[PDB]
């Protein structure tokens, strides 16, 4: 099970509201 999120809060290509983060993915295997 793979879930990826982009914490960046952006509106328009030239504006990000909060702080900067890379995209991250998390995998869960049972």
């Amino acid at each position: 099970e793979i879930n990826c999120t982009r914490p960046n809060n952006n509106t328009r290509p030239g504006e990000i509201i909060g702080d900067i983060r890379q995209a991250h993915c998390n995998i869960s295997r049972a």
Partner: nanobody
Amino acid sequence: QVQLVQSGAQMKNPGASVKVSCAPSGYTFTDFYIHWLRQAPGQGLQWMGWMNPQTGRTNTARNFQGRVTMTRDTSIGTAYMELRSLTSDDTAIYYCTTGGWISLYYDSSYYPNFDHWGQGTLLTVSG
């Protein structure tokens, strides 16, 4: 032991600029956000901004849109808050605080978790 040591009190004439410093020790400077707030007796608690010690990226309150600059000197691990075009309304105690723990997986810049506080810096604007 965590200490946030701020620079001393200052008197500025109106129109001038003030640069307040905040040197944290007793923990990893780059692990937590740094916030800036200020307080006057005849007003409440006024949040001014945040800074990410790692990258130097900041965000400032709307009311300080373009008269505030927050920076940091990495070699001496010291945060700076500069306030320009002072008036008598800027007379206040200014505080540097710690903030949320910095994680790769989410943004905690806006967490009002101010565990530790500087001793404060009294700005007087007379002129």
